[PDB]
Amino acid sequence: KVYGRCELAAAMKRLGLDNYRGYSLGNWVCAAKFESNFNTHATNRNTDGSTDYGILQINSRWWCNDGRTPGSKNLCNIPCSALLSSDITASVNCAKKIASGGNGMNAWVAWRNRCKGTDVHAWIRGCRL
C-alpha cells in the first residue's frame, strides 16, 4: 500500500498516534517516509539475518516472529506478516510498544537522522486532520 501523506496521517491520527508519548503526528509520518517511503509492504533484509517490516520498518530480531531469524525474540507478540498489510494498526500498535522504551522514537534511525529537529508539521500541513 502506497499511502498518501494526508491519508496515512489521518489513519495515524485516529489510532491515537498523536502526542503518543508526547510526539506530534508529523514525527510519525516523516518516520514512515524515510523508513519505508510510505510503502506498507517494504522489507529490508539485514546482515545478522534480520528483516525489517512495513510502514515503520519494524525488525524481527526483537519485535516480531517470522521464524527465520537465527537469533532471538518477539516483544510485540505478533507475526511479522501482520505488519505487511494495507491496514497499519498492527505496525502502529507495535510501534507504540517500541517508543515506550527509553529511546522513544530514536529506534527509527531514519526518524532521528531526518526528522528529529525538522518542521514536522511540514508533513501534516495540508491534511484534513
Side-chain angles (χ1 to χ4, degrees), residues 35-90:
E35 282 295 352
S36 82
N37 178 78
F38 301 153
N39 194 357
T40 73
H41 214 297
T43 51
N44 268 277
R45 191 219 148 254
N46 291 268
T47 323
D48 83 346
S50 50
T51 314
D52 302 339
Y53 299 83
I55 207 68
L56 238 40
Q57 288 264 273
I58 300 203
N59 182 276
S60 50
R61 201 39 130 289
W62 345 93
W63 316 108
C64 60
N65 196 337
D66 57 9
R68 150 216 72 78
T69 320
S72 309
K73 31 224 183 183
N74 187 185
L75 291 341
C76 292
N77 192 118
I78 227 107
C80 306
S81 286
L83 302 184
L84 293 152
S85 64
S86 20
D87 182 13
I88 53 75
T89 99

Side-chain angles (χ1 to χ4, degrees), residues 84-104:
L84 293 152
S85 64
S86 20
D87 182 13
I88 53 75
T89 99
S91 294
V92 153
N93 277 304
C94 182
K96 290 166 162 171
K97 293 192 74 175
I98 295 164
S100 60
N103 280 347

Side-chain angles (χ1 to χ4, degrees), residues 117-128:
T118 58
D119 180 284
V120 300
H121 352 71
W123 304 86
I124 65 184
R125 297 187 227 141
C127 329
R128 314 146 316 153

